[PDB]
Structure formats: structure tokens, C-alpha cells
């Protein structure tokens, strides 16, 4: 399996998927995105890799995009999905059952707090209930087969709140909040817990790292990444995180780290092709060649 990267910005969104093997070391360029965007989100289900939302920045546009599209690594092709309901810039994902959530994003002035579902099998969106908070660049994660909503940007304040998504009750409940305001962090479920790491409150880009134990209901502080980054990219492989790119306040990054929880340690692994902020990724069977 392998760490793919979707689209991104560089000065403009960016088309490329690229893919990330962390045992050999190499990047592997696979086939465009149909339209460049950055601020979309990455999921697998199945086998398949989703590109979710997002916006194409280009010197002619800058368009909010509703897309969903699917990546099938044995044919090195995408397809397009139905697509949601809105346009979603810096939107959030979580997979339960086979089913993609998507959560919050902006379209234009406009900050979501609705959430909708898609169906696989029948190609199919359908709205669900609305977060209690409006979220856009919100971190999202699923935990014990409830989606988390963690942070992001009202439009006027950045935040720190987050909450549960209950879906066969349709109903979203405030957890405990984090230590940390962050909009644009990257949010993963690794071993049994929620990280949050990086991000930015309004004043800083964040390297902190902080964890939920949902039996606790408790965030708590861990080993800080090597550097400070907004808008990055997150992922688990193999029981270690990997968060890729982001933007420091002056540079759009290539780094990317990997974090140990049995040391709390984090390094430098590789540096992607080139750096970039905003982009979706998520791990899936490597290509088929």
C-alpha cells in the first residue's frame, strides 16, 4: 500500500496524484486530476481513492468545486462521481460502513454547517443532519463508527470545539474541546485516539500534536512536529502518522513527517516532489503496472 497525494496548491491548485511508497522511498506520478483543486479531501473505500471537494485556483478562475471523483489504481484512471450538493472548499471527510461524509467547507462567503453522505453502491448524496457549528478547513476523523469534527473556521472566529456525529441517531453532540484553536489541521484516528496536529489560531501556524481518548473524553499534549504548518495533509500507514505539506507563513512545504506513538517521536521521512499545501490523501494497493 502506498500514501497518495491529490491535488494541492503551489501559487495555483494543482493536478497531480502522486504516491508516496514509505518502505523503497519513491514518488510515483499517476494520472492528473481531471480539474486542479486544492482544499479537497481524500478517503478509500474500497479499494478506491475519493477526491472530495475542494477549489480550482487558476490564473482564468477560482472556482469552488462540488466534485467527487474516484481513482482505481489497477486501471491508473479516474472517473467521475454524482456530486454533492454544494461546493465544499476546505472540506472534511470521514468513512463509516462504506460511506463517505463530507463536513462543512465554504462555498464563496458562505461557511457550511451542513453534512452529507455518499453512497457507493448507488452513486448517490443525501444530506444528513447539520454540525452545530459552521466549519470550514475542519479536521474529521471516525472513531468507533462515530465522525468527529474537529476545529476549523466559522467565518468570523477560529476554534478550538468539537463535536460527535451520531448517525443512526442523526444528531451532533459537543465533546470536550481541544487545548488548541486550529483551523486547518490535519486530524487522523491512529490506534485508539483522535490526533490533531498543526493548524493555525488566527495568529501562529501550529506544530503542536494533541490526542482524544474518547474513554477519558480528554485531549491531551504530545510530541510537537519538527514544523509549524497550516492547510497540511494527514494519514495513517502501517500504525504511524504521516502528515504531508502545509504552509508555514512563508513557504508552501515539501516536508514531510512521520510520527511513532511508541517512541512519541516524530522525523523527517522524505520530501515530496514539490511543496504544496491543501491536499487530500489517503493510502490504498499500489498501482498496478
Given at each position: 500500500?502506498?500514501?497518495?497525494?491529490?491535488?494541492?496548491?503551489?501559487?495555483?491548485?494543482?493536478?497531480?496524484?502522486?504516491?508516496?511508497?514509505?518502505?523503497?522511498?519513491?514518488?510515483?506520478?499517476?494520472?492528473?486530476?481531471?480539474?486542479?483543486?486544492?482544499?479537497?479531501?481524500?478517503?478509500?473505500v474500497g479499494?478506491?481513492?475519493?477526491?472530495?471537494?475542494?477549489?480550482?485556483?487558476?490564473?482564468?478562475?477560482?472556482?469552488?468545486?462540488?466534485?467527487?471523483?474516484?481513482?482505481?489504481?489497477?486501471?491508473?484512471?479516474?472517473?467521475?462521481?454524482?456530486?454533492?450538493?454544494?461546493?465544499?472548499?476546505?472540506?472534511?471527510?470521514?468513512v463509516?460502513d462504506g460511506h463517505?461524509?463530507?463536513?462543512?467547507?465554504?462555498?464563496?462567503?458562505?461557511?457550511?454547517?451542513?453534512?452529507?453522505?455518499?453512497?457507493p453502491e448507488?452513486?448517490?448524496?443525501?444530506?444528513?443532519?447539520?454540525?452545530?457549528?459552521?466549519?470550514?478547513?475542519?479536521?474529521?476523523?471516525?472513531?468507533?463508527?462515530?465522525?468527529?469534527?474537529?476545529?476549523?473556521?466559522?467565518?468570523?472566529?477560529?476554534?478550538?470545539?468539537?463535536?460527535?456525529?451520531?448517525?443512526?441517531?442523526?444528531?451532533?453532540?459537543?465533546?470536550?474541546?481541544?487545548?488548541?484553536?486550529?483551523?486547518?489541521?490535519?486530524?487522523?484516528?491512529?490506534?485508539?485516539?483522535?490526533?490533531?496536529?498543526?493548524?493555525?489560531?488566527?495568529?501562529?501556524?501550529?506544530?503542536?500534536?494533541?490526542?482524544?481518548?474518547?474513554?477519558?473524553?480528554?485531549?491531551?499534549?504530545?510530541?510537537?512536529?519538527?514544523?509549524?504548518?497550516?492547510?497540511?495533509?494527514?494519514?495513517?500507514?502501517?500504525?504511524?502518522?504521516?502528515?504531508?505539506?502545509?504552509?508555514?507563513?512563508?513557504?508552501?512545504?515539501?516536508?514531510?513527517?512521520?510520527?511513532?506513538?511508541?517512541?512519541?517521536?516524530?522525523?523527517?521521512?522524505?520530501?515530496?516532489?514539490?511543496?504544496?499545501?491543501?491536499?487530500?490523501?489517503?493510502?490504498?494497493?499500489?498501482?498496478?503496472?
Open positions: 500500500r502506498l500514501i497518495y497525494t491529490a491535488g494541492g496548491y503551489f501559487r495555483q491548485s494543482l493536478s497531480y496524484l502522486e504516491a508516496y511508497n514509505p518502505s523503497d522511498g519513491t514518488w510515483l506520478r499517476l494520472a492528473d486530476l481531471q480539474v486542479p483543486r486544492s482544499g479537497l479531501a481524500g478517503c478509500v479499494g478506491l481513492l475519493y477526491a472530495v471537494g475542494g477549489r480550482n485556483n487558476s490564473p482564468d478562475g477560482n472556482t469552488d468545486s462540488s466534485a467527487l471523483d474516484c481513482y482505481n489504481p489497477m486501471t491508473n484512471q479516474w472517473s467521475p462521481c454524482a456530486p454533492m450538493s454544494v461546493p465544499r472548499n476546505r472540506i472534511g471527510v470521514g463509516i463517505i461524509y463530507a463536513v462543512g467547507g465554504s462555498h464563496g462567503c458562505i461557511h457550511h454547517n451542513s453534512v452529507e453522505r455518499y453512497e448507488r452513486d448517490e448524496w443525501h444530506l444528513v443532519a447539520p454540525m452545530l457549528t459552521r466549519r470550514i478547513g475542519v479536521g474529521v476523523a471516525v472513531l468507533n463508527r462515530l465522525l468527529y469534527a474537529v476545529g476549523g473556521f466559522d467565518g468570523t472566529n477560529r476554534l478550538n470545539s468539537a463535536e460527535c456525529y451520531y448517525p443512526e441517531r442523526n444528531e451532533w453532540r459537543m465533546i470536550t474541546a481541544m487545548n488548541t484553536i486550529r483551523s486547518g489541521a490535519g486530524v487522523c484516528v491512529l490506534h485508539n485516539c483522535i490526533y490533531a496536529a498543526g493548524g493555525y489560531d488566527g495568529q501562529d501556524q501550529l506544530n503542536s500534536v494533541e490526542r482524544y481518548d474518547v474513554a477519558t473524553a480528554t485531549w491531551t499534549f504530545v510530541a510537537p512536529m519538527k514544523h509549524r504548518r497550516s492547510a497540511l495533509g494527514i494519514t495513517v500507514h502501517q500504525g504511524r502518522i504521516y502528515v504531508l505539506g502545509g504552509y508555514d507563513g512563508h513557504t508552501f512545504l515539501d516536508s514531510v513527517e512521520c510520527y511513532d506513538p511508541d517512541t512519541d517521536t516524530w522525523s523527517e521521512v522524505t520530501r515530496m516532489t514539490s511543496g504544496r499545501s491543501g491536499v487530500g490523501v489517503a493510502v490504498t494497493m499500489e498501482p498496478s503496472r
